[PDB]
Amino acid sequence: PSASEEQVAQDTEEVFRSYVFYRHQADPEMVTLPAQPSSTMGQVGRQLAIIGDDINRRYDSEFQTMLQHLQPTAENAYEYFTKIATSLFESGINWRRVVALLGFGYRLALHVYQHGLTGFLGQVTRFVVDFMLHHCIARWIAQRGGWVAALNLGNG
After folding, report:
1. Binding site: which residues?
2. Residue 25: Cβ-neighbour burial (10 angstroms; 0-12, 13-18, 19+)
């Protein structure tokens, strides 16, 4: 329902913040220990970092190259995020692309901090939370069992 969709969207901050910490293992805001690491959503983000490292290296390389060609700053990051994220889902939603979105967010926050020296992980967290809510992705996850479904995506 609308409620379960909203619930997934409310859980995304914790998932993404855990995902980033485990994916990152120089950018200090990614080294900060995650809040509530052993919470269910913390564990979801941990698992998404594993499966992304296993199966999403092609997307990772793509986003690294895109951001090298772009050279986003805090001032234009939102415009690039929106167009790239939107294009990622134009042919539909699947778990591969949900993981890819998180990875794009990680790379965007990393690039912006490393070049402009202003914190940006919190801003990208909001970009990702809002994007999933506004582009039927939280709804799609809710229809498949909520974020806990990401504890059983296929990694061993």
Report:
1. 130, 134
2. exposed
Question: Residue 116 is part of which domain span?
Answer: 2-152
DSSP symbol at 70: S
Give the method of determination.
X-ray
Burial of 134 (0-12, 13-18, 19+ CB in 10 A): exposed
**CATH code of residue 140:** 1.10.437.10
* Tally of domains within the chain: 1
Q: Are 8 and 144 in contact (CB under 8 A)?
A: no
Note the resolution in Å, 1 decimal. 1.5
Indicate the burial class of 15 (C-beta count within 10 angstroms; 0-12, 13-18, 19 or more). buried
CA–CA gap between residue 36 and residue 134 (Å, rounded):
26
* Residue numbering of the annotated binding site for Zn(2+): 130, 134
How far apart (Å, rounded) are the C-alpha atoms in residues 136 and 105? 18
